[PDB]
């Protein structure tokens, strides 16, 4: 499901080597190390990201995300 869509408000590197972003007021984390530079890049260049997951509660995990340039 499309959990959240918007700019990245903050990103965070977590001590367990996971990575979190806040999109549309709700936080989501991911385990995939390849997404860390992709997400920080989106945050810095103003890309609209669409977090996609089967579990969309704030604080939940994800591993699918679309990137649009604005």
């Amino acid at each position: 499901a499309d959990c959240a869509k918007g700019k990245i408000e903050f990103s965070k590197y977590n001590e367990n080597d996971t990575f979190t972003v806040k999109v549309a007021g709700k936080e989501y984390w991911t385990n995939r190390w390849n997404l860390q530079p992709l997400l920080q890049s989106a945050q810095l260049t103003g890309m609209t990201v669409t977090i996609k997951s089967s579990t969309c509660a704030s604080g939940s995990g994800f591993a699918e995300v679309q990137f649009n340039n604005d």
Partner: protein
């Protein structure tokens, strides 16, 4: 059209360049502060040029004002130099499209690029020195030139005159740093690595600055303008983008990041880093 760069004093030098700028370019709405601006070259037809007379290098000489430099208008590239005492126009090979009525045109073997000129001159722009004295010898070298094959001494002269004419026209920083050599103290101007790097990013700066709208700063590759006054103090004239030198790749001139305007290609060039995780072998 015809213009003159008068090297008599610092003030005649600055006024000469400003008169050329006023005629061939238009200030940017969002980067000007009185009579000091970043100006965009007005579009002229291909092959359009200006003939810039050189004068005032030795005021004890009523006949040292017979060197001219031909400068393509859309790009401020020096197409060649004219000896008015012998009515001979020595023209670089990449400018066959520039023709002058009533002057004996000589088509030369080599081109106008700094790579070609530095090689023949055995002199790198970075660290190169220019004084009133060495500009006089540069004038002598070009007026004593003959043939169709550039020499070491003529190439050194061109490199010096390009910096204090065309590059100074583009960059107020080069104008300001060099004009100190026109003092009675007669100091020596050294073209710094920073000065050279500015000329290597002229097209890149020209593509970014038209998008400026009061941001705290501007970042273009290795160039940093940390406030708007740093822009005006460095840049005077830019190309008209929308010229091939305006674009490297892509089609997004800038990315605004935290009230700093970035050349998008610069950001892309340090954002394409994979997870360092993957720096691995054979596992």
């Amino acid at each position: 059209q015809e213009f003159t760069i008068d090297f008599s004093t610092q003030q005649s030098y600055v006024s000469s360049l400003n008169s050329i700028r006023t005629a061939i370019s238009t200030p940017l709405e969002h980067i000007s502060q009185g009579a000091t601006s970043v100006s965009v070259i007005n579009h002229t037809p291909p092959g359009s040029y200006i003939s810039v007379g050189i004068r005032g290098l030795d005021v004890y000489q009523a006949h040292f004002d017979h060197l001219r430099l031909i400068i393509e208008q859309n790009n401020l590239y020096v197409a060649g130099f004219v000896n008015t005492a012998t009515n001979t126009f020595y023209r670089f090979s990449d400018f066959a499209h520039i023709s002058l009525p009533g002057v004996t045109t000589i088509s030369m073997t080599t081109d106008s690029s700094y790579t070609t000129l530095q090689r023949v001159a055995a002199l790198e722009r970075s660290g190169m020195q220019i004084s009133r004295h060495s500009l006089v010898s540069s004038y002598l070298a070009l007026m004593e030139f003959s043939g169709n094959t550039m020499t070491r001494e003529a190439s050194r002269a061109v490199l010096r005159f390009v910096t204090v004419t065309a590059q100074a026209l583009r960059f107020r920083q080069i104008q300001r740093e060099f004009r100190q050599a026109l003092s009675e103290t007669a100091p020596v101007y050294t073209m710094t690595p920073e000065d050279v790097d500015l000329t290597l990013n002229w097209g890149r700066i020209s593509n970014v600055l038209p998008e400026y709208r009061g941001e705290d700063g501007v970042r273009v590759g290795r160039i940093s303008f940390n406030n708007i006054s740093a822009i005006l103090g460095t840049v005077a004239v830019i190309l008209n983008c929308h010229q091939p030198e305006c674009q490297i790749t892509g089609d997004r001139p800038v990315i605004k990041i935290n009230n700093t305007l970035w050349e998008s290609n610069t950001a892309a060039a340090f954002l394409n880093r994979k997870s360092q995780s993957l720096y691995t072998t054979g596992e």
